[PDB]
Design a protein around this ligand. Structure first.
Ligand code: F43
Ligand SMILES: C[C@@H](OP(=O)(O)O)[C@H](NC(=O)CCCCCCS)C(=O)O
Ligand SMILES: O=S(=O)(O)CCS
Ligand SMILES: O=S(=O)(O)CCS
Ligand SMILES: [Mg+2]
Ligand SMILES: [Mg+2]
Ligand code: NA
Ligand SMILES: [Xe]
Ligand SMILES: [Xe]
Ligand SMILES: [Xe]
Ligand SMILES: [Xe]
Lengths: 243, 442, 547, 547, 110
């Protein structure tokens, strides 16, 4: 699959996120316990609450052909993880996430907004996905944020440390260490022990990995082949609706 | 036949049934089974005899939390259901041995009623089914117990509710699949104002049978709305065949090839391959490491893309066993396939647009609800002309119990009664057989 | 003495029995303080805006007869009829706004979604936290997003959310500021009936701002309510601010467990929810709170409902929504002024009480033919013996409504059944028509002639118990002088029976609330207070306007 | 300088180009004068009523960033966003009331019935006598019957009836107090177009009282109008007060020659006539009177329509009628604050003027692909170069609506056709979505994705010229950030062409009236006046309420 | 011809289209019947009246056997005549929406 047209770094970064054969660059190591703490749906070691009994406990050719994910077999709840991406060269961006999620992950419910992007799926499968979303180049601890509510910041100016605005301040930059610590879960509840999220990517690497077009980076109007395809779809949609 | 297209018909198990069937043999205007499905929906009414008895016994009539103290009537309606149903059928029928059907269910607690077709041959719309059924059972109950003139109005309230003070049958103890004609978003929408939960309930949560029935209802309404007329008729017939009828086993094969490990993106890649394999699309232009695809048959590309859309829904929401992600699948299958190919998505963007609001109005505060409460006459999901609702019926069929407003909560009377008719419960069977029987008359 | 004698003596110098008086020498409109105020105001209006307006010389000259004052029944307040026009009466406008901006929303499905789909606990402590959250958000304030602009708390001071439940122990654990206390508002036997009807259910009574209700329409109420319920559910129970389960609360609040005051109307009289035409007669009887304060006097309870409905249905609904202009003020005041309907109905009550005993009469046509005929003849004879009474209620429609309301309510006092009371209403019309060879206006008895055969019909758009009927019942959809009285006949048998409610116990509880602006326990007393320009309504824009 | 620079400098201490600022140290809600007023008011409100209300400690703490002031575009008025909430802004409420209480009723069929069926004469002198009669009766005063009670003329001082006609001699013969003079209100070339459209027809502009419109609903307007027209026809032309021919006037006034501001809505969004959802985009452009005072600046005319529509459709209609609560104030203020949309649209005008010249471009997809793409890139680049601008219009929906409106209006400036302007609107969305990998809220581009295929469709519920579409167009029925801008795109090609009207010449003339309360020639200026609490609305009850 | 579409006293200046529909009513009505009919031998009837100024259309009964109510008659007739007019004169994509407004009015806004 080609996934997306264009000849800029942005276009290639969008293809890289969508291509399941592209191995996402791992930038940090996060423990399983910290991921469960960041999600905030259950305490580490707490059993998965069930919305319905396990599947083993009707006749359908589709049901027999589509292998369910492990969380659906057990009857786990559908929980979420939600990210906010700064328009100042965050590596991932809202529509890039949803497009990439439905190429890479099974049983995914993705939603795109300007100030947030959410995926809902079975709880134990979300934890496996959230690990990759938090450890890889999908996430930057300064220009990106895990936010279940009060997501204001994607379009705001940065603070003195280069951190994106957060009404609840879930991610704290440490001036002494140069690393970001997550002091609350994505809904804003204080954690017992913060989770180290590593150092923010420098401005050189952000522009190398970002998927947003900007005039002070790579402008969308200069990626003439990408614009041409969007204009082509607009014209073909118009003609199809007429006849 | 107006069109040259022919399709190979398959069953809900991926087995070939009939090869090279003209496209219009599946048309609602020609297929006798689709005619039997549409006419059956118009004339079928469920009567809750137990609910009527409980309403009369408690004087709880006319809407939620409503009661008139002092109006209680203790009538053994369920105990006398045989005599009551026999008297009602005598008033419902036009002549003896016509197609009037009255059957008791649940030991007399329920009643399946099918108003004779002769009443509809001289009627403008479909309201004769509940109105004749309600008044026949009201009269039958009154005659059975000799309810006095001063008490009979409570039997009327117990059966049909607060009508005509309310516009609807508010608090009634009868149910149909269609709603009152006043609630149509527009003329010709009546076959769309059928809740997805209603379809899933009476299909008994079979994915392919729910998908076929939803497509049958949606595309048949496209004929009544005038959308499937002239330049657009072939597009709607092709969409009916490939997306809802498993034409050429395309939906089935796509689901089979991506069922164990596949995603929406993997279903797209296989669908684009199949369209290129079958000559539906061809490389029109080459950009920098990007092939621009074109087609000389937009209606056929739309049908192929619509098949993969249904298959992507079955793969994505089937793996999760939760229907809620169907709004995401309907959106990004179409978003991804446009930048994958350079061709317009299903319904030329209208499925993607419908999915945007459907995602919103099923994950926010401003209205909507669960996927099962939507329908073609909902303001949120009326915009795509028959290509989006069938995927929701397939998704709700795969939901393993994650919905508060499931068909068991909003369509309980439908699941018990309307599923008993074999035409509605397994429509893929009869529509394929009927198309084969008329293949040489098209 | 007859209850209307004092009012008649206040109106005219002659004795009530005198058949002669003098006309044409009263000075026209100059006899009236109110008309004089209007003439001076019309001059100022025309002068300020440069367009002629009120002019007593347009058309025919008002005031060739006595321009009567009216006694508001059950009070000693005497006003000119112009003071009872809904445009000139802020108490009447606020009564409708208080109904229009109210909706009842259950918490039972929502709490089930919280515990099952979200796996979180619901306790009286969480309900209190939610209620404190929703009473901040409901008037129009933020709880989640950053950089939100909000409504001025003083402009929306009348909007709030309360809850009630039949479980006394649960009710005592919720913060009492948010609880409608059934045990404090209703007498013992009524409170036990209502608490038994509600059971373990928890129901919200939501009132949106009057200023919004006046700016928008009735269909806004349930939508405005649902948005702020949904936001407060997100905040109080720590949901993601927009996930899949959030859609359940929206559907629950907008459709699943919501009780509208009025259902929507068909196209010819196109109107959304919470408009007067959608309010059934049973709801209107239950909105009126006379039942819980005058429960020993079923006549007083029934006639307070008549006053509620006559003003709403005839003056605001039929007199403005469906027509407009000068309107139907005196078409309605005939039913709640000068103690005229009171005298007629207290007669029928005593007649029924002595002959049958309340609710002891047979529920058949014999009781209808007896009670309705006796009360009708008594009522019509009062106009024949007191010429000042006949000149007072000068319109035949007025008289037909008052006489038949007494006959209908009295028949319902006898049978304990509203349907035979309705049959007595139409019999009163037929006897009235034959006695005086006249009835109402050109089209008064459309429904009245359809009446007898449709009382006990069971056909599609004909058969309904009176409690379920309303202004959208086909025969009733057009004409003045009926709907408010039908609401009184619906209240009549339940008031005589001692029932806590007529049709919906949740509606009855929803208006037993001291934080309402209009006092629904004293409807006629509120009408008099608004006529005297002493009523303080909500929704004014004075705070955001210059001095 | 960019037109938005001044507003950005007033909002923040930093220069508009700076990418960094400081947060969390502003004191929360204490940074704002308005929030401080709300906190104090909520404390007084809660104490007075005994129920908690506004509480800044509920939910999340507002004010971690700068709580911005907003410049009302084309003015020098700076207010906090709460002052532009429709509940807090009496000018916004009065703008909708002036539309809701207005109806246009022809006199042509009525005059024909008088002369043919009644055999009576109609002259300019009789029309003046009728107009003097109707301006007494329309506010709620009697002309025929004895012992009528009337509305207080001072409470209904805003109700009146005027007439207009294309015949200068007929207009000059009617008393000028009742005449909307087309020659005085419109420039010459516009006046000739309107007078040629009207011809010898005579049309009434009826405005019923604001206090009635707020008490009732929009469907009251045409009924209230018809009642008082019929009574004045009976009085002025000496009919029997109720004969057969009287029925003709009623049907004429209620159906035959009546122009509603809004048509009724289907059941799901059940509403009668004259509600915002029924007002098509072409009517809204003609209601706005910027076209007759700013006819030399097609950008100024188009954006005054955007301001008119964004407030009504998003804040009042979608933000209250269809939802409610805190609402959609800033979803709409993005389109009429800080001169942002002005800067974007003046760019596209000059681009079109320099490259094509206004209305000289081909009406095809080539012009769409060129102008819409160029204007879109300009709009998005301003957010990229001015971080304060991106922090100002922080919501993606806000940005998508502003950018696409400029692209749509500019494309319409080029083609002189609103349908290609609409196609440019949706193209802007597609380019915007791909450039920033984001667009609007969760469900912003439902219509935006359906857009391209439905611009030139011809099918049943898909095909319509943009002037005929409105809030009931199926794709448009739900979502903010479109409807007000669609009205501006409807105005754009006619403003560039110099047309006197967009869709209905009678609607355009009917609001060229200085006796209106709201000044539709300066919509944004009126919004600023209401934000400063200096606007005096109609419909207040102060006269009938205690001090 | 006057761009007066969508209701009383309504007009969109600049949208005018001069088409000789009545002069070609025979070809237009024949083209519409081809789209209205289900088969060549159903009960579809299309007749011109007043020299082509009017057209009597009877939608075939086969469409109503699979319809819930009666709105198929105006909706199928309207779209068939809209498409027939557009095909007859090759009305461009940018102007065709005016033919739709002239035939069916302000629906679906109204
Ligand atoms: C709970 C929801 C989900 C839903 O159905 N509506 C919400 C909330 C609702 C509430 C918020 C009131 C409160 O705070 O109590 C209100 C005011 C509607 C109401 N009930 O009165 C509203 N949104 Ni929302 N909402 C808005 C917006 C937005 C933008 C904000 C993006 C950002 O980065 O700040 C995003 C959608 C997007 O990503 O594009 C958004 C989301 C959301 N919106 C998320 C909450 C997001 C969060 O947790 O912070 N709104 C806007 O884009 C601007 C206008 C603004 C509206 C208020 C106004 O117009 O003045 C408000 C309109
Ligand atoms: C969707 C539909 O609601 P229901 O799903 O029917 O509850 C519809 N409301 C709306 O469209 C809400 C519009 C305003 C809130 C969203 C603004 S983006 C309506 O009430 O008719
Ligand atoms: O004379 S009519 O009875 O038509 C009018 C009654 S208000
Ligand atoms: O977050 S949502 O887009 O659903 C709400 C927008 S106000
Ligand atoms: Mg008081
Ligand atoms: Mg002024
Ligand atoms: Na109102
Ligand atoms: Xe079904
Ligand atoms: Xe859908
Ligand atoms: Xe009572
Ligand atoms: Xe103009």
């Amino acid at each position: 699959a080609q996934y997306y047209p264009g000849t800029t770094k942005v276009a290639q970064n969008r293809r890289n996120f969508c291509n399941p054969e592209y191995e996402l660059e791992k930038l940090r190591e996060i423990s399983d316990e910290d991921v469960v703490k960041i999600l905030g749906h259950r305490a580490p070691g707490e059993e998965y609450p069930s919305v319905h009994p396990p599947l083993e406990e009707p006749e359908d050719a589709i049901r027999e052909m589509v292998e369910p994910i492990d969380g659906a077999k057990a009857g786990d709840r559908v929980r979420y993880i939600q990210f906010t991406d700064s328009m100042y060269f965050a590596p991932a961006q809202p529509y890039v996430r949803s497009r990439a999620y439905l190429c890479r992950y099974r049983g995914a419910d993705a939603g795109t907004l300007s100030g947030r992007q959410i995926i809902e799926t079975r709880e134990r499968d979300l934890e496996k996905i959230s690990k990759e979303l938090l450890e890889t180049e999908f996430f930057d601890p300064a220009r990106s944020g895990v936010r279940g509510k009060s997501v204001h910041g994607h379009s705001l100016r940065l603070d003195e440390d280069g951190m994106m605005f957060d009404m609840l301040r879930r991610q704290i930059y440490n001036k002494d260490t140069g690393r970001v610590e997550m002091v609350k879960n994505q809904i804003g509840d204080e954690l017992d022990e913060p989770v180290d999220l590593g150092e923010p990517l420098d401005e050189e690497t952000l522009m190398e990995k970002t998927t947003i077009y900007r005039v002070d980076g790579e402008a969308y109007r200069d990626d003439v082949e990408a614009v041409e395809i969007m204009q082509r779809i607009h014209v073909l949609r118009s003609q199809g609706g007429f006849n | 036949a107006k069109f040259e297209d022919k399709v190979d018909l398959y069953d809900d198990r991926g087995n070939l049934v009939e090869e090279q069937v003209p496209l219009e043999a599946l048309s609602p205007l020609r297929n006798p089974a689709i005619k039997s499905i549409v006419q059956g929906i118009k004339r079928t009414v469920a009567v809750n005899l137990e609910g009527i008895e409980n309403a009369l016994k408690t004087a709880k009539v006319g809407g939620p939390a409503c009661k008139i103290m002092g109006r209680e009537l203790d009538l053994d309606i369920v105990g006398n259901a045989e005599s009551i149903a026999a008297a009602a059928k005598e008033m419902i029928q036009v002549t003896e041995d016509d197609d009037t059907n009255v059957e008791l269910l649940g030991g007399g607690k329920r009643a399946l009623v099918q108003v004779p077709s002769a009443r509809f041959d001289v009627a403008a719309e479909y309201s004769a089914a509940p109105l004749v059924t309600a008044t026949a059972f009201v009269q039958a109950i009154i005659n059975e117990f000799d309810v006095s003139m001063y008490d009979a109005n409570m039997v009327k309230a117990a059966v049909l509710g607060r009508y005509p003070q309310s516009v609807e049958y508010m608090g009634a103890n009868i149910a149909t699949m269609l709603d009152i004609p006043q609630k149509l978003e527009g003329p010709g929408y009546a076959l769309r104002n059928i809740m997805v939960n209603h379809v899933v309930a009476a299909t008994l949560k079979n994915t392919l049978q729910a998908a076929a029935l939803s497509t049958i209802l949606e595309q048949t309404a496209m004929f009544e709305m005038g959308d499937a007329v002239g330049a657009f008729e072939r597009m709607h017939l092709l969409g009916l065949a490939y997306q809802g009828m498993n034409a050429d086993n395309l939906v089935f094969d796509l689901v089979k090839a991506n069922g164990k490990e596949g995603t929406v993106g993997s279903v797209i890649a296989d669908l684009v391959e199949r369209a290129l394999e079958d000559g539906v699309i061809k490389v029109e232009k080459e950009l920098t490491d990007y092939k621009v695809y074109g087609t000389d048959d937009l209606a056929m590309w739309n049908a192929y893309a619509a098949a993969g859309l249904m298959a992507a829904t079955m793969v994505n929401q089937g793996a999760a066993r939760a229907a809620q992600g169907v709004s995401s699948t309907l959106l990004y299958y179409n978003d991804l396939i446009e930048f994958e190919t350079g061709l317009p998505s299903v319904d030329f963007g209208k499925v993607e647009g419908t999915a945007v609001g459907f995602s919103f109005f099923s994950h926010s505060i401003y209205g909507g609800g669960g996927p099962g409460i939507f329908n073609g006459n909902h303001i949120v999901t009326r915009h795509s002309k028959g290509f989006a609702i069938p995927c929701v019926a397939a998704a709700m069929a795969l939901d393993a119990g994650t919905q508060m407003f499931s068909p068991e909560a909003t369509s309980g009377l439908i699941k018990e009664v309307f599923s008993q008719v074999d035409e509605f419960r397994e429509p893929l069977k009869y529509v394929v057989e009927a198309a084969a029987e008329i293949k040489n008359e098209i | 003495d007859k209850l209307f004698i004092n009012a008649l003596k206040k109106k005219f110098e002659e004795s009530p029995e005198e058949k002669k008086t003098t006309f044409y020498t009263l000075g026209g409109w100059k006899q009236s303080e109110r008309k004089t105020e209007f003439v001076n105001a019309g001059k100022e209006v025309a002068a300020k805006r440069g367009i002629p307006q009120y002019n007593p010389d347009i058309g025919t000259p008002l005031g060739q007869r006595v321009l009567m004052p009216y006694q508001v029944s059950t009070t000693d307040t005497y006003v000119e009829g112009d003071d009872l026009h809904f445009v000139n009466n802020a108490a009447m406008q606020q009564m409708w706004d208080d109904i229009r901006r109210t909706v009842i929303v259950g918490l039972n499905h929502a709490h089930a979604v919280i515990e099952k789909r979200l796996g979180k606990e619901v306790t009286p402590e969480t309900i209190t936290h939610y209620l404190e959250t929703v009473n901040h958000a409901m008037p129009g304030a933020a709880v989640v997003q950053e950089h939100m602009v909000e409504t001025h708390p003083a402009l929306v001071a009348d909007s709030y959310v309360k809850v009630f439940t039949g479980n006394d122990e649960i009710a005592d654990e919720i913060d009492p500021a948010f609880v409608i206390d059934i045990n404090k508002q209703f007498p013992e036997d009524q409170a036990e009936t209502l608490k038994a009807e509600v059971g373990d259910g928890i129901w919200q009574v939501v009132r949106i701002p009057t200023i919004v209700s006046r700016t928008c329409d009735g269909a806004t109420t349930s939508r405005w309510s649902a948005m702020q319920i949904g936001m407060s559910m997100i905040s109080a129970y720590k949901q993601a601010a927009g996930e899949a389960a959030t859609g359940d609360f929206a559907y629950a609040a907008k459709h699943a467990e919501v009780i509208h005051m009025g259902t929507y109307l068909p196209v010819r009289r196109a109107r959304g929810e919470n408009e007067p035409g959608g309010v059934p007669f049973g709801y209107l009887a239950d909105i009126c709170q006379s039942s819980r304060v005058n429960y020993e006097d079923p006549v007083r309870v029934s006639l307070d409902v008549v006053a509620t409905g006559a003003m709403l249905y005839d003056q605001i609904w039929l007199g403005s929504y469906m027509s407009g202009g000068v309107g139907f003020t005196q078409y309605a005041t005939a039913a709640y002024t000068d103690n005229i309907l009171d005298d007629f109905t207290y007669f029928g009550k005593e007649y029924v009480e002595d002959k049958y005993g309340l609710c002891e009469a047979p529920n058949n046509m014999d009781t209808v033919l007896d009670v309705a005929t006796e009360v009708t003849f008594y009522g019509l004879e009062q106009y024949e013996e007191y010429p000042a009474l006949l000149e007072d209620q000068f319109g035949g429609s007025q008289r037909a409504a008052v006489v038949a309301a007494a006959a209908g309510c009295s028949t319902a006092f006898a049978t304990g059944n509203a349907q035979t009371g309705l049959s007595g209403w139409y019999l009163s019309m037929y006897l009235h028509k034959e006695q005086h060879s006249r009835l109402g206006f050109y089209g008064y008895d459309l429904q009245d002639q359809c009446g007898a055969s449709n009382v006990f019909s069971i056909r599609g758009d004909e058969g309904l118990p009176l409690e379920l009927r309303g202004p959208n019942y086909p025969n009733y959809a057009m004409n003045v002088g009926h709907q408010g009285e039908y609401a009184g006949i619906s209240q009549a048998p339940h008031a005589a029976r001692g029932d806590a409610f007529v049709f919906n116990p949740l509606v009855k509880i929803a208006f037993a609330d001291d934080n309402l602006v209009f006092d629904f326990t004293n409807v006629r007393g509120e009408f008099a207070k608004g006529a005297l320009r002493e009523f303080e309504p909500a929704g004014e824009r004075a705070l955001i306007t210059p001095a």
